[PDB]
Amino acid sequence: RNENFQMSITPIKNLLGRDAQNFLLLGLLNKNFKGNWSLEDPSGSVEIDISQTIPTQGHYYVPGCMVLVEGIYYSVGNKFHVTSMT
Amino acid sequence: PSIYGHDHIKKAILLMLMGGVEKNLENGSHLRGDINILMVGDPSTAKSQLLRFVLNTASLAIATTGRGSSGVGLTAAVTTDRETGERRLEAGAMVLADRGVVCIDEFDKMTDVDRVAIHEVMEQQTVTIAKAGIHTTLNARCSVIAAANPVFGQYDVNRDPHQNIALPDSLLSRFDLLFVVTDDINEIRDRSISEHVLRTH
Ligand SMILES: Nc1ncnc2c1ncn2[C@@H]1O[C@H](COP(=O)(O)OP(=O)(O)OP(=O)(O)O)[C@@H](O)[C@H]1O
Numbered sequence: 001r002n003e004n005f006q007m008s009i010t011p012i013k014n015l016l017g018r019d020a021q022n023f024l025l026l027g028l029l030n031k032n033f034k035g036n037w038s039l040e041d042p043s044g045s046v047e048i049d050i051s052q053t054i055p056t057q058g059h060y061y062v063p064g065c066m067v068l069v070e071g072i073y074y075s076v077g078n079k080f081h082v083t084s085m086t
Numbered sequence: 087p088s089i090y091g092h093d094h095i096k097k098a099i100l101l102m103l104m105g106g107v108e109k110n111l112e113n114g115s116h117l118r119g120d121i122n123i124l125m126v127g128d129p130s131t132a133k134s135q136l137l138r139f140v141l142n143t144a145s146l147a148i149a150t151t152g153r154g155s156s157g158v159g160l161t162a163a164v165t166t167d168r169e170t171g172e173r174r175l176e177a178g179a180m181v182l183a184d185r186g187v188v189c190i191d192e193f194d195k196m197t198d199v200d201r202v203a204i205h206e207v208m209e210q211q212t213v214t215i216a217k218a219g220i221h222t223t224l225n226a227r228c229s230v231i232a233a234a235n236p237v238f239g240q241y242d243v244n245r246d247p248h249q250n251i252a253l254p255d256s257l258l259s260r261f262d263l264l265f266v267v268t269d270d271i272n273e274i275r276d277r278s279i280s281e282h283v284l285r286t287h
């Protein structure tokens with residue numbers, strides 16, 4: 001219901017066949033049982049790459065909280081390469 | 087337009103619709119102008135939904151199933167004319183589709199005794215009847231499109247092609263284009279085809 005949003009937030013499982021493009025994912029930030037950083041929504045879950053992430057300074061990024069994220073999904077593995085975080 | 091993909095088979099069907107030019111040659115011979123296509127493939131690969139489309143779009147089309155057909159039901163049958171009293175012939179599936187097309191489904195499931203007759207029609211394009219004092223040659227100039235399945239449930243790439251198809255070589259030589267189609271698992275293909283099917287429904 002925010003004014004700015006009307007890219008829109010896409011469910012995670014809608015990314016299972018795409019090999020390109022951009023997506024706006026919203027979900028819990030946590031660690032998988034394998035020890036890798038991941039994002040989770042009621043639809044599903046995905047692993048997250050922070051190697052080249054540029055966060056928006058001004059707040060705290062602690063596991064267990066909702067995060068808006070932007071990036072590109074790669075189907076060679078199952079990874080959402082992040083480029084922005086808020 | 088409700089089938090996703092299979093562009094080359096759809097081109098082959100169109101070339102079937104516009105047949106070739108038949109050449110009449112000395113010694114009482116004719117070079118056939120019909121194009122005959124066979125499709126062998128995996129289960130659920132839209133083989134049977136193209137035969138149904140050919141049935142509707144073409145001017146003349148006759149549908150046949152392998153197990154529910156007989157040799158006397160494809161060429162001709164001896165019957166009687168009640169009104170006048172003579173003995174006559176009644177046309178079968180092949181001869182009723184003169185200058186037309188015949189679409190056969192489950193072609194490999196046809197019995198051997200049934201499969202010889204179609205051989206002759208595929209070769210001479212004529213039927214010979216010599217039964218009950220009726221000696222006649224009947225004209226049958228039809229195009230054949232057929233669909234079958236391999237010997238096993240699915241096509242095997244680790245075995246020679248002749249082992250996969252149970253049909254004999256003599257029958258297999260009489261088809262202009264043999265299309266082996268396989269369903270391969272790929273996420274992008276699945277995402278596109280599922281979207282198309284869900285849009286259709
Ligand atoms: N490429 C496709 N596009 C649309 N629908 C398809 C496609 N492939 C398969 N289907 C669907 O699959 C179902 C079964 O297809 P069909 O009956 O044509 O298969 P088949 O090759 O004759 O199978 P079988 O080997 O079991 O005889 C139909 O509902 C059909 O719409």
Ligand SMILES: [Mg+2]
Binds near residue numbers: 133134191
């Ligand atoms: Mg079928």
